[PDB]
Amino acid sequence: TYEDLISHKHDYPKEIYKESHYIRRNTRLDVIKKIPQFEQKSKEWLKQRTESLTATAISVVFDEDPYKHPIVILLDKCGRGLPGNKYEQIGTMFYSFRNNVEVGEYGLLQHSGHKFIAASPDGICSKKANTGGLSKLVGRLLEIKFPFSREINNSGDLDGDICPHYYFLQVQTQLYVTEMDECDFLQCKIDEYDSWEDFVKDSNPIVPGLSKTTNLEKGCLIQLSDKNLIGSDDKEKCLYNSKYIYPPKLHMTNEEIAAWISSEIANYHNNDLSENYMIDAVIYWRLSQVTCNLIKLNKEAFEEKIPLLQQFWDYVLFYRQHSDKLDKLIKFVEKVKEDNSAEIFSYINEDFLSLNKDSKYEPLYQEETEWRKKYNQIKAK
Amino acid sequence: ATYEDLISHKHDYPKEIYKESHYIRRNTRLDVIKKIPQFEQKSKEWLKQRTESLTATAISVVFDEDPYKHPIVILLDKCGRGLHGNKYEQIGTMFYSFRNNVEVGEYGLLQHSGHKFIAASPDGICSKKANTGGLSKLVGRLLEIKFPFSREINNSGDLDGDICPHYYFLQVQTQLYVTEMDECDFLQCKIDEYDSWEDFVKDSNPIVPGLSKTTNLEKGCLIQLSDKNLIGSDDKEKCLYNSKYIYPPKLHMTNEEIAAWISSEIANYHNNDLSENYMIDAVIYWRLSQVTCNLIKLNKEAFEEKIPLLQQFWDYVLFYRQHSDKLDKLIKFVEKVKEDNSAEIFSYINEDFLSLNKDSKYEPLYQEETEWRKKYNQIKA
Ligand SMILES: [Mg+2]
Ligand SMILES: [Mg+2]
Ligand SMILES: [Mg+2]
Ligand SMILES: [Mg+2]
């Protein structure tokens, strides 16, 4: 009854892609694989992070983010201030399984034309179906969120209600960078079992790979603890700074689970992360609620907003080379609060125009965006 | 047996006025401390007070005697650059106040009289007032409460190294030096939270309701208040950093008065000042599982021998606060050679300092590893 969970709705019936969009998406993905990924925390990876605005920052720069204001993005890219998730891959394996397509993760990708706009999608579906043949999901991005207190809505506007707007802008920027058309917005709630006993207790009788209370997959997770830190540290720095070893596939039998845990222990002497991280605990998880919503790219609507992003990045490049004016800017934001974007960026645009006498740039955020007004309205009460 | 059997009266003072000299000096010092204004912790004016001094948690790092941070991060922090915890502190206080029969007060950040760049903020100081009336011998005794989750609490071995981790010992030393007191109780607590109110009332000790029958330590309730600015945020920092808490009035409450306090607190929450900025979130039920207390006395001479190093470090901080260019190129220099190489980093810093102060007689810091750095390196490798 396990094979009944593999949906074949996206299996492509032909050997070669006939429709044009499938061909272009596959070709673009093949171009993406040719783009070199880089090792973490070293090499050009710094020259990739500092040279662009990540997709999660674009919602803030648009003045359409409900928690951060543009000045924090401006100061972050200049190294100043004021004073992912651990289950993501599990979601990837769920989507790859139930939709019968191979999903690959790729590092940070910068847009070809506007290099200062970059994004890192949680995964892109390849052309290969799992049960053989091609798949219709080729080139479809994956964006997976794990809210803890927020309730997942399935009705209402796609831009506002089903998908939170800042996440919607993140997906739009991701689709713009990778030059793809579709992205699946997957929202998952995960509970962890107290013990292995409770894990085997909640097993669905007819199907061992599911939970009997949520009718969704369950599995294991290996936690690798940082060494420098932790050892005897005392807070939540340890949680964020853990890395994880993930199971090979879902719907594992209990024996295969324990055998894989042990083999992972023995071979961790050769695991690179275990040499730099210590095997901590073994977590047992189950999916409790999974929603998926297709999001398509509006390219013209984003290109209309590219000029604003260009002006913002020009401000970043400006204050990166003038440390004195950056200090006096920090004092100016110290005076009037950081949510007052109109005055802050009027000051910033003056500072910019003072040394660039041929810039037609006008101050940004002079009027609240419609989303800013909506958020402030939601604040009352 | 009533809960009053747990109240130790060993520190009850029999007279009305303090006769002995040390009690008089400690009480007078406490009265002097009360006149110095403290700010609303965690918010602005406090955070501005911290930037003008080296806090007690930084001294272990500056001494090159901290196993997790190196002095360069303290230097860069004070110049505005980069690159089961506090929530139960009050609960710990209420435990210490109960079993030791003394009133404990919080006093915020205090700066040292002579060296104003050395400041400390104790988790609490015992007043002269005993709980059952009269004076107490614990007047002026500092309180420092720690909540390890993975660290094992040791009961034997060195006080400076084994019972109290060395960095914590230096924190307590700085607190005793700043507050000009003589003794501090180092309290270490482990707390687990109940799944349900049912488990709370079931785990009540029969003869004494205020204790747990499985841990033989106090249990109680706690009200969690979530920030309003953040509603649906998917960060764990969301409220857990920005949350405020409503605490019970006393320990050893009966179940009925517990429920009455929860209900009355919920209903009256609208007249609360916090009601306009915070929402009642969850109600947590806690019990203590392990509590250790260890007396630590001040070694004033050993700290004053180390004050010159702190003065030189703070002079470096004041130096780079005025030279943004040299701070930028310093940060790039720390990008080159790693942050753990304090000898090279602060040789560079001493060069940069002597270039504009050609007669300050300062020699490079951290040219040789401290013995504690050696021990930590042995444990790390
Ligand atoms: Mg991103
Ligand atoms: Mg993501
Ligand atoms: Mg402190
Ligand atoms: Mg503390």
How many whole angstroms does the radius of gyration of chain A measure?
23 Å
Q: Approximately how much helix is present in the residues of chain A?
A: 40-55%
Q: In oligomeric terms, what are we looking at?
A: homodimer
Largest inter-chain contact set: A-B, 30 and 32 residues
Would you count the extended β strands of chain A for me? 11
Main beta-sheet strand count, sense and barrel state of chain A: 7 strands, mixed
Q: What best-fitting shape of chain A do the alpha-carbon axes yield?
A: globular
Task: Tell me the series of helices and strands of chain A, N- to C-terminal.
Answer: EHHHHHEEEEEEHHEHEHEHHEHHHH
Measured between the Cα atoms of the first and last residue of chain A, the distance is: 50 Å
Ligand species: magnesium ion
Structural class given helices, strands, pairing of chain A? Answer: alpha+beta
Question: Into which percentage range does the β-strand content of chain A fall?
Answer: 15-25%
Number of DSSP helices of chain A? Answer: 15
Q: Give me the side-by-side strand order of the main sheet of chain A.
A: 2-5-7-8-11-9-10
Tally of domains of chain A? 2
